[PDB]
């Protein structure tokens, strides 16, 4: 009931893990292709844990 | 944003929509052209007579 949400903006996020997780023959993502994630621009990003 | 296998669905949807639009436009133009041709034939007859 108090899930913490952090505002991320004016940044470069932790793209490295998934960017380097590219030689893998398998990818697990459905909203958007992981590979393209590092060739776009976002107005704002939300992270929840 | 998406990858080959996913993009194809949206590509197909847009293709169907735009093809339908073109078909409607062409049919309307054909009918209008027939009408104008009838008028032009009448005008030619009026001139000759």
Swiss-Prot record, chain B:
The record lists the effect of residue 45 to I as: In strain: Gamma/P.1
Q: Which domain of life is it from?
A: Viruses
Purpose of the protein: Subunit of the fusion protein that is processed upon entry into the host cell. Mediates fusion of the virion and cellular membranes by functioning as a class I viral fusion protein. Contains a viral fusion peptide that is unmasked after S2 cleavage. This cleavage can occur at the cell membrane by host TMPRSS2 or during endocytosis by host CSTL. In either case, this triggers an extensive and irreversible conformational change that leads to fusion of the viral envelope with the cellular cytoplasmic membrane, releasing viral genomic RNA into the host cell cytoplasm.
Q: Any idea what this protein is called?
A: Spike protein S2'
Biological source species: Severe acute respiratory syndrome coronavirus 2
Source lineage: Viruses, Riboviria, Orthornavirae, Pisuviricota, Pisoniviricetes
């Amino acid at each position: 009931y108090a899930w913490n949400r952090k505002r991320i903006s004016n940044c470069v996020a932790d793209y490295s893990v998934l960017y380097n997780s590219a030689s893998f023959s398998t990818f697990k993502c459905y909203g958007v292709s992981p590979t393209k994630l590092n060739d776009l621009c976002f107005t704002n990003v939300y992270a929840d844990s | 944003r998406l990858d080959p296998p996913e993009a194809e669905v949206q590509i197909d949807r847009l293709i169907t929509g735009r093809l339908q639009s073109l078909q409607t436009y062409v049919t309307q133009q054909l009918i209008r052209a027939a009408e104008i041709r009838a008028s032009a034939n009448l005008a030619a007859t009026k001139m000759s007579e």
